[PDB]
Design a protein around this nucleic acid. Structure first.
Lengths: 289, 204, 132
RNA sequence: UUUCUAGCGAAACCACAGCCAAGGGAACGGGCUUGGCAAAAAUAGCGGGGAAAGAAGACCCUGUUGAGCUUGACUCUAGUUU
RNA sequence: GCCGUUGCGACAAGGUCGUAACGAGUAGGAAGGUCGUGGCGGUUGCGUUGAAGGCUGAGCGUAGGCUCGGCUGGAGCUUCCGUCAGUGCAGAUCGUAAUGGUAGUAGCAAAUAUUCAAGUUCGAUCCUUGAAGACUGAAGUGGAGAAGGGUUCCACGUGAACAGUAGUUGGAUGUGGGUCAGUCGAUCCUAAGGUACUGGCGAACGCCUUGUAUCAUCGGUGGCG
RNA sequence: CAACGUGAAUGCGAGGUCCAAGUGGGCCAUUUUUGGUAAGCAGAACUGGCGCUGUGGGAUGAACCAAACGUGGAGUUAAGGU
RNA sequence: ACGUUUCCGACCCGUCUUGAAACACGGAUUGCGGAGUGCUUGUCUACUGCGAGUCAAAGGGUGUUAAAACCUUGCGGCGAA
RNA sequence: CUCAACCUGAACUCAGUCGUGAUUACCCGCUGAACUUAAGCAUAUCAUUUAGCGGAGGAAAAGAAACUAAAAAGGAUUCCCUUAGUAACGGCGAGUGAAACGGGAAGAGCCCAGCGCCGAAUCGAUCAGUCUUUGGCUGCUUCGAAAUGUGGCGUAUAGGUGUAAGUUUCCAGCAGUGUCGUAUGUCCGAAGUCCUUACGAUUGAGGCCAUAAACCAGAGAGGGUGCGAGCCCCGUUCUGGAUAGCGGCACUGUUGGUUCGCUUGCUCCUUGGAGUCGGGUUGCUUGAAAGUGCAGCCUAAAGUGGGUGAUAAACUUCAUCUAAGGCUAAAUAUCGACUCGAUUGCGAUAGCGAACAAGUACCGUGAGGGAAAGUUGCAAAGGACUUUGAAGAGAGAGUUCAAGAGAACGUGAAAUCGCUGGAGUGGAACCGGAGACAGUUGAU
RNA sequence: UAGCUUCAGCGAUGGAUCGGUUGCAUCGAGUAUCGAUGAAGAACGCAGCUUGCUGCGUUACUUACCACGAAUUGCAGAGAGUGGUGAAAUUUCGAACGCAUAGCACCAACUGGGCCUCCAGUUGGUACGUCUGGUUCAGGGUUGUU
């Protein structure tokens, strides 16, 4: 997107200089029309060019490291297998049988949205689609005027291994995406950059997963030359278990409290008990007196 | 006013560069257009290979590249004669002819001769008139297998091979490699001066 | 979702086409649905409304009223129905424009061309319903 | 003419506003300090003050800012002679 | 006593708490901002039983600002997470639009001058009629034209605007009408001069000469027909 | 290599690297001091200030005396005063 | 609390300036608009992936929620003297 | 001196053709600045660029080596990445600045002059036949072009003669048969206006046998309809169907024309562009540096000759092409024109100057300059009628969800201004701190 | 009291803001089509009532043909009217063509004026450069013949 390169610069405008009791901004020339003598060009002027007109050759697209793309896709796939992350992302998986949810290859044979809807409803995934239906709304702002009239929630994504044209059964269901396991899109696996998309795996795709993304052994992937599952920098990722392990407990010292300071300095010169506590001989001296 | 330790500026933007600007927003569109053109050409010239004419094997010119080979413009007349193909026959059969290239070495000639022989072996020739086949013409069950080839015809192989381990020989070990290299350099450098000295001695 | 690359999902383009459509296109735009009985009788779902048809108002402040359509004010995208009128201040009577999409056809004005059109629509409906 | 009346009806200017003495302060205050004082709303004049208004001083200087003109300034050139 | 900064410390926490000292600030540098604005990918919700916008009481926050209440309004708006920016105005003799004091004020004073009765009108210094009194004073405030204007010409209506008062009147405004040529002009001739042809020049659009430069530039009586 | 062991006072944690802003008109005062008849003049030395800074006092004041600043309270004072 | 009345304090903001309340300049009033940006090239710093490697270009293959995503480099850039 | 040729040059309202002038985004040839940077300024830079002139197309231009180079070599042109901010240029200052190799997109080759052979075997008008007639095919038609040479073979890979082997058609139209595309027209399409409720108006809320359920969904894009709609309508999906037309293909038939060739071996013969190249000097230009490209003047060739091999000159090793003649698609550029699809862009002071009777009103003699201006309501239902006034206008009334939506009509801010009530009011007014009053608000 | 200032309420002047949007900006795709057969542009004119805008050209807000199939609409009014578009037509200036450039003049036919040497009307034609051919020519320029 860019503004016209000549926008605001189509006036043969000259400054009046000093001595005319007006600002030295360039002004439209001529007469007989209200435009004559009005400020031109400058960004402060009505009808002038904006400040630093936006250029068409801006840096629109980006180069993204292939290794980092693969890492992100793998991390999204792994996060899709955590029920808590799906709930945090807002998917309704209250009654879902299992996560990851693998389904038989018959789903790839579907041809009718009626079949697809029946399958979803019996699998107890219709709650997500109902939430999508309730979530459809009007987008706020100028986006309405720009072919982005509505905003609605995202539903599950069905991943297939061998397309028997099964996407036709699912296209028309709101919020439901369909993908081929060979070419998995991060934009659909982690919409909005958030982890925990709800995925319906077919048996073929679930089996091909190991072939595509390999394992933790180096160069274990066959369809991605030299790729393998990344290794973690932390083996046990739950912070409380290490802290309360036997070795750590043995090494740790017993907990303490905040050191206690007197805080308030009293006046033993004015009081009796304090002075005697600090110096017991003062009582003897006073007795002698 | 550059300040501190900097690399002196070098940007070439002192011309009215805003008048000459080229963007690449149509790169995927151009990719799709070229794919569509390839598909149209394939339909037009089926079952012939989409790549078109067969190209020759070449050695890259300079010593920085002469250890590699690549595809050439075509086959030399010497190469065609060695392979037993006329220039006209090559033209009608779909073999590129490089009228400018000439062979000065048997190995280079023979590599392309073998390439031509292999292509001729793989070639399938349809009858000029379907009803009446002729000599040299391929057989019917061969024609039934004809399919369009995509990509380069007889693509080259760029795999690198490692020589088999062997034994180190005493003759090899006894050579003075550095002294040999320096001797060759000295001989080339001082050839002319030695010739001048020899001529002067002969005159004396 | 549309798949045709030559069909535009642009709201502005759609609105411009709708509001600058010529008369023959406004004829198609101003279509009305057949009642249930007429739909089972004729085999079609909707037809471009025509003068001298009989309709029943299905929505609005005049819902339930019946009558014959006098005019198809294509310029105003409305139809004037018999007996659906109000009184101006002076006392004169003016028909109230109703959008054909909010009425239902109760009887078709049939002639040679309209019969042919209904036959075409019914045959196409039968074909597609059989395929489905 | 001004003046008063009926009708009609602008503009300049305007940080906020308009009583003084001395003091000190950007060395000449309407504002600050100490004193003199201090009572609505107005009409007609007036030219002391508002360092009054008109104009980013046409004087002087600075700028590695110009332009008209001159020549024994530097570098060129139409033309002309050979 | 409270707020915050700094240092240190406790606690299974991008957090809470404890503790001692500390707290000036132009130019300038950093940090925090559940301060504010507009998009995008997502997420959380509200809405014709009333959104945005607008006016303004009960509160909240050191502040940037925010929440709620009441009234107006009639269709959108919003939480939080990332990320992006045409993201915050008191000034720039800033741009643009509108509005004040001045102020019912300066002023509407050159060209001698108007008065009486009547008419019309809702309404008359100003329109019309009559009577009177003055002026231009024939190198006119008279009667006609050239350039220019273009309907301003004439008739009948006129309510608003305009006629720097007024207006029943008007070069205004609405509706109509109006310019008649053998003899008046143009048309025709050439003047100063312009511009073509050739010719030459010119990278070219095209320029130069109107001249023996260029140049094979024709037309007149008669017979015959 | 063998032995010897912290050798004046007081105070206090120390050292290293990188990136970069603004500034590059200063002015005033005690003392010293050059030009000048002098100057609220021109030019220097040490230190402290104003600039960047409010607060009590000197009626008033950029620099003088006291004293430097989160927001409040009680008590006591500095210079100055009754 | 932008109401009234009392006691104390209280000079008009922005700007250049050693010094502004200045007899220095801009500012009659209000609304809306209004000024460190884009890109190329460096350098440092923070974060992320891999690591003697890393990134891969044009391109090709695929992809119809097809300008995306996914796959793909005897060779090229930087680094390894 | 008569007549007849040729050569040269004319006139024709002679028969039939062709050119002119527009367009600007891209393309080709010329002409050609200064601002600016160098912290001044003249070479330099801006820039071989604004401006000016001419000439085409759907692309243009270029293009089949008088090339790159120095390997074990590549092999027309165009374009991309890289080479590379490198070699190089530069008051060696500011600054400027390529190419080959390498990886790719696309790839297509050819024709003359000359020499030699046939030697007019060639061609235009006109006439007459004939056909599928905005053009073609046949001639004892008649004229003319052409020996100052049209056509055939033939061009550096050469070529030709003879000879031995093998091998031998190709174009254009018409009709049919299918096979496939069409930014080409026209026609055709699944499912609720169901019950209750809300509303001015629903598309808003709830319910519609069933474990899985209102129904359709290969259609839940978009728009319209009284804001909200897959299911009311147009539409959307059917890698949509039917139909008519345009095209491209493949095969059959048929009409016209055309084919003594083509390749490899052997034999003999043969083989090429001049005021051009090159050189001197001058000016411009380039990264091109004792001259990269271009041009003026002088000089002016040769025939294993000529050019080139990036430092000038002789004498030497070679390597590589063949200048001074010509044609040629694709990859590439470009929204100026016509037709389309989109968007992290603007939302009426923004976005094009122009959302609207916008290049309009208006201004200038002229070149030229150039605005402001969006919104009643779902529907005009646009306020009948009564009443005062000459009228504007007002008081009633009516329409409407609503008119305080009443025509300059959605909302309706601030500045500014008028009224009613309260309170203050001695040459400013505002303001911070602290009370009081009036007032506001809370109290299981 | 009035005036002035201020507070609360009400009302003016003004047109900000908010809410979309047949507009604009940018990106991408497909195609190649101006003119003497008169272009681009300009002028004038054309409707029952219609100034402007849009459309059109004397057949003038359009004729014919083909598809669809009942309207247009402000008031009238009477295979409609829309779309496509292959037939017909397409005013005057304008490269602009008879010469000039806001005017006047030549050629041929035909028609009317009674006849026509004179008038009037209609039709067709008369531009520059250039190519091919045709006709009529000029020159001791070269040559042949009497």
């Amino acid at each position: 997107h860019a503004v016209n390169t000549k926008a605001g610069k189509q006036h043969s405008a000259e400054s009046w200089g000093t001595g005319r009791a007006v600002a030295r901004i360039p002004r439209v020339r001529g007469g007989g029309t209200h435009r004559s003598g009005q400020g031109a060009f400058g960004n402060m002027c009505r009808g002038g060019h904006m400040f630093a007109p936006l250029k068409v050759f801006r840096r629109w697209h980006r180069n993204v490291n292939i290794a980092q793309k693969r890492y992100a896709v793998s991390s999204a796939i792994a996060a899709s297998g955590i029920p808590a992350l799906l709930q945090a992302r807002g998917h309704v998986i209250d009654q879902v049988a299992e996560v990851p949810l693998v389904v038989s290859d018959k789903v790839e044979s579907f041809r009718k949205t009626k079949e697809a809807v029946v399958f979803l409803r019996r699998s107890h995934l219709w709650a997500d689609i109902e939430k999508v239906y309730n979530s459809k709304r009007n987008r706020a702002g100028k986006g309405k005027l720009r072919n982005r009239q509505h905003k609605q929630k995202l539903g599950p994504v069905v991943i297939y291994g061998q397309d028997a044209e099964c996407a036709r059964a699912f296209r028309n269901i709101p919020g439901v995406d369909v993908m081929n396991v060979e070419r998995l899109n991060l934009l659909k696996l982690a919409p909005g950059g958030h982890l925990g998309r709800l995925i319906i795996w077919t048996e073929s795709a679930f089996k091909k997963l190991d072939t595509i993304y390999g394992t933790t052994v180096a160069n274990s992937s066959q369809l991605k030359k030299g790729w393998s599952v990344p290794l973690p920098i932390m083996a046990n990722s739950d912070f409380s278990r290490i802290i309360r392990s036997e070795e750590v407990v043995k090494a740790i010292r017993a907990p303490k409290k905040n050191p206690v300071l007197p805080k308030v300095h009293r006046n033993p010169l004015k009081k009796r008990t304090l002075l005697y506590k600090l110096n017991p001989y003062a009582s003897i001296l006073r007795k002698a007196s | 006013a550059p300040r501190g330790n900097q690399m002196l500026g070098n940007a070439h933007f002192r011309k009215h560069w805003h008048k000459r600007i080229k963007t690449w927003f149509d790169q995927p569109a151009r990719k799709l257009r070229r794919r569509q053109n390839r598909q149209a050409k394939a339909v037009e010239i089926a079952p012939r290979p989409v790549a078109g004419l067969l190209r020759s094997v070449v050695r890259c010119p300079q010593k920085r590249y002469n250890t590699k080979t690549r595809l050439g413009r075509g086959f030399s007349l010497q190469e065609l004669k060695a392979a037993g193909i006329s220039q006209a026959q090559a033209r009608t059969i779909g073999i590129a002819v490089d009228v400018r290239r000439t062979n000065k070495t048997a190995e280079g000639l023979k590599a392309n001769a073998d390439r031509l022989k292999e292509y001729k072996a793989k070639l399938i020739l349809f009858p000029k008139k379907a009803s009446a086949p002729k000599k040299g013409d391929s057989s019917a069950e061969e024609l039934k297998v004809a399919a369009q080839l995509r990509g380069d015809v007889l693509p080259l192989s760029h795999t690198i091979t490692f020589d088999e381990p062997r034994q180190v020989t005493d003759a090899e070990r006894k050579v003075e490699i550095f002294r040999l290299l320096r001797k060759e350099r000295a001989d080339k450098k001082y050839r002319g001066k030695r010739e001048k000295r020899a001529r002067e001695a002969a005159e004396e | 979702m549309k798949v045709n690359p030559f069909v535009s999902s642009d709201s502005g383009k759609s609105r411009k086409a709708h509001f600058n459509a010529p008369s023959h296109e406004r004829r198609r735009i101003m279509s009305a649905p057949l009642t249930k009985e007429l739909r089972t009788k004729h085999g079609i779902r909707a037809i471009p409304i025509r003068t001298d048809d009989e309709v029943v108002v299905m929505r609005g402040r005049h819902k339930g009223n019946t009558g014959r359509v006098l005019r198809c004010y294509r310029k105003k995208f409305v139809i004037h129905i018999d007996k659906i009128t109000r009184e101006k201040a002076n006392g004169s009577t003016v028909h109230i424009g109703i959008h054909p999409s909010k009425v239902a056809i109760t009887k078709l004005k049939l002639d040679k061309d309209r019969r042919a059109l209904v036959e075409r629509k019914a045959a196409g409906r039968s074909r597609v319903t059989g395929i489905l």
